Design a protein around this ligand. Structure first.
Ligand code: PRO
Ligand code: PRO
Ligand SMILES: [Mn+2]
Ligand SMILES: [Mn+2]
Ligand code: NA
Ligand code: NA
Lengths: 482, 479
């Protein structure tokens, strides 16, 4: 069958991947008692966009649900699936003659059918008449709430949809649940994205020199991922935190655009990834800017390495993800106590939520077509209203096929530390005189991507992780663009 | 005063640049008979966006009119200017404490006042109260039509604006006209963007190899502009057309994503640039993939080079830009005839609009904060309804301070050639027996950025252009 490919050593992704997803969605919908026979799934692709009122085009990236079902890269398309048969039909725009001058070849309907291995291809302006001729029960459209953004999914619509019976409640929870569980074909892509990004992280560690700007490493990472990986997009805005910036979880945005000079003695926290064909990776490496851990840096870093490996070692089907978050908290507190930053009963620290002072974010999240993938809080799965845990992007139990990030971290965040020092329930645990040394330290985060198996997990990421390994990697005398 | 800077060898941009723009706008509005005393210009900045319904953040780039006036990089801001006094007030979001954990330090209002050198800073939620305090005659908001996209500019709005008198017709043509004419400080930035982009084009020519994918060069170009120039964003989607893809003017979009393998004998057309601090550059270099021009490639290229230099040599204040487009058409037809592709009277070719077959786009466009900058077609300036000329992005007369691209090109586009061969008014001019050899050639585009001066132009771009210069640059020669 046909496959998506950018040549060179990039991965060939079979379009059968998306046919399997369409089939899995139909199989699940058929088992839903509320689903009438003759139902048709209707999805609307993304459209081209420009900057504000200008004609400056924004690079198009397909909507995730639509890509999951069809894998279509072209803007302005629709896609429908007959639930009972699973028959797929892709609607493409009818392009004007001038498209041949400015944009490129005007491909046939037959070309798209062969390209995407769908059952039929029609023009977008025909969608109402085509659907009418098919005598459908009900049009199943996408509407639901993304539990990370709070946004409502955009329901498909076309002129003449008035005429149909539309249900916009059934589909979202079912297609979400399908996306939660990755097929072996999806997993082959996620292995690939992790490979390229792992290689790019290694190159960054090799290249980093005191005096460079953080964004120089962002540029190198993205250049490796694009030129060698075909990853034209980044799965998110790259986070290149040097020094105290490594305590800023989502550093690198426009308000704080990776513009700090890397100084001798800094800890680097590089949380960056790209996507290949809308499939994500999410990896974070922490390392000393000058290639040699100090004693304090080693202690903080190896505390996070310990929680990382303890969580991965415990992960298997049936494990409650909040329990893993709480395991990482307890480990961090134990290590911080060993360092002398903390004193007293770790049990009491945990009862007082002291772990969230040092890790205010969730231990990890689902990963897939979106870096913060869907399905973390389906109906009946509630968010825990406790420090740290409330930032978890899922409170679910692990099952085979789920793809998770494991990204424990320890950070020295002034306003969270100051809050704790003012709370008598937590101040007694903290040793101000030792902690003062760690103000401005920043933080360490170690992020791995894993797949839940029948017996445990499969690690997708392959980067240096121990102190010895990182120091060996950064000292490696051996990718020189220009 | 304070300056924008990304360190290393990047350009320090003084915030005085934007203060001057604010000054120029007030001076122009004070002379507008429709403007009454006590008027306040109100602009709304861009906001953060995400991918569809996800929480995947989109890299924020400021709206261009707002940037021109204030140069603010943060999302969620408003900006207002008192016309009579020129007093500027920046409105910044009131951030939650959570921001200190996830996004970074919560800067004080005084921090932003210092950073942007504005007269006052307030929080966005206080805009209604602050403006009511000032007792304005009218609020001058932004609404108009962009003549390249056809979009309507987003007019500023806030809770309680209904209580004010709002005019949305006066500002747009005036702030557009200010943007048409670049101050000396703006030119310093456009000189820098051209510098970096030119260097990146040189590096690409040095690095191209047969067998590479087009997007490998896109990646290298962006990496140079960002790592060495601080051009985090690119000014538009890079166009890396190899072979017949060089006949596609806006190749490289999602539908045609620079994924062709570069083959021996191919002509490369690389139309790619970046922006620094929302200031654009627009450069195109054409060159043979294997580093050596064939005879045919030399002929097509030097035809475009001749038109390029003819236009640049003729550009000066008072010149009508469509005349420069027709000048390029005539030179193209002359040289295509000299190559044996065409035969007959060039006068007759021009009268038949044959030039548009080979250059179906406009000769060049205004450049500034947007690659296709504003002000090309103000009221009274009409689009010429003829092939080629109708694609011009401005029909204005050149004046000092204008910044334009000069990007003639020659392409071999089958459906346009076939249309001409079926047209008796044009068919006799084309020699099939020679044209057959150039089918699938692609095309050549040579794009320079220039500033109109009192004497002529200042050329901002600095890349190799002659056949000998290009072959030398791709052989790694220092220059
Ligand atoms: O947003 C999240 O959930 C993770 C935590 C650190 C940055 N990314
Ligand atoms: O859009 C325009 O006007 C020019 C023509 C070639 C590509 N850019
Ligand atoms: Mn993550
Ligand atoms: Mn241009
Ligand atoms: Na992360
Ligand atoms: Na151009």
């Amino acid at each position: 069958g046909p496959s998506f490919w950018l040549g060179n050593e990039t991965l060939k992704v079979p379009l059968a991947l998306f046919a399997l997803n369409r089939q899995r969605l139909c199989e699940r919908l058929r088992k839903n008692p509320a689903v009438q026979a003759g139902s048709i799934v209707v999805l609307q692709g993304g459209e081209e966009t420009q900057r504000y009122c200008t004609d400056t085009g924004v690079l198009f990236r397909q909507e995730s649900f639509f890509h999951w079902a069809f894998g279509v890269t072209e803007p302005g398309c629709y896609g429908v699936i007959d639930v009972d048969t699973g028959k797929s039909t892709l609607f493409v725009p009818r392009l004007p003659a001038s498209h041949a001058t400015w944009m490129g070849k005007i491909h046939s309907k037959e070309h798209f059918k062969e390209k995407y291995a769908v059952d039929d291809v029609q023009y977008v302006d025909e969608i109402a008449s085509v659907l009418t001729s098919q005598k459908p029960s009900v049009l199943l459209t996408l509407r639901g709430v993304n539990t990370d953004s709070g946004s409502v999914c955009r329901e498909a619509s076309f002129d003449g949809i008035s005429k149909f019976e539309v249900n916009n409640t059934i589909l979202h929870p079912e297609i979400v649940e399908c996306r939660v569980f990755k097929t072996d074909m999806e997993l082959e892509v996620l292995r690939y994205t992790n490979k390229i990004s792992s290689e790019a992280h290694r190159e960054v560690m090799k290249a980093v020199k005191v005096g460079m700007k953080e964004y120089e490493l962002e540029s190198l990472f993205e250049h490796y991922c694009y030129s060698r990986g075909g990853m034209r997009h980044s799965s998110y805005t790259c986070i290149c935190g040097s020094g105290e910036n490594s305590a800023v979880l989502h550093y690198g945005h426009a308000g704080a655009p990776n513009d700090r000079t890397i100084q001798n003695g800094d800890m680097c926290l590089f949380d960056m990834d790209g996507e290949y064909y809308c499939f994500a990776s999410d990896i974070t490496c922490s390392f000393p800017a000058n290639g040699k851990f100090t004693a304090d840096q080693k202690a903080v870093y190896e505390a996070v390495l310990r929680s990382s490996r303890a969580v991965m070692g415990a992960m298997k089907p049936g494990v409650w993800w909040p329990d893993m978050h709480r395991l990482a908290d307890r480990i961090h507190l134990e290590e911080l106590a060993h360092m002398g930053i903390l004193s007293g009963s770790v049990d009491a620290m945990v009862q007082a939520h002291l772990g969230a002072v040092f890790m205010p974010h969730g231990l990890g999240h689902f990963l897939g077509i979106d870096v913060h993938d869907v399905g973390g809080y389906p109906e009946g799965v509630e968010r825990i209203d406790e420090p740290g845990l409330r930032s978890l992007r899922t409170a679910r139990h692990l099952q085979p096929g789920m793809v998770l990030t494991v990204e424990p971290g320890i950070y020295f965040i002034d306003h969270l530390l100051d809050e704790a020092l003012a709370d008598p329930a937590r101040a007694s645990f903290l040793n101000r005189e030792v902690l003062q040394r760690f103000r401005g330290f920043g933080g360490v985060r170690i992020e791995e991507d894993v797949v839940v198996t029948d017996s445990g997990i499969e690690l997708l990421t392959c980067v240096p992780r121990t102190v010895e390994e990182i120091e060996a990697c950064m000292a490696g005398c051996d990718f020189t663009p220009f």
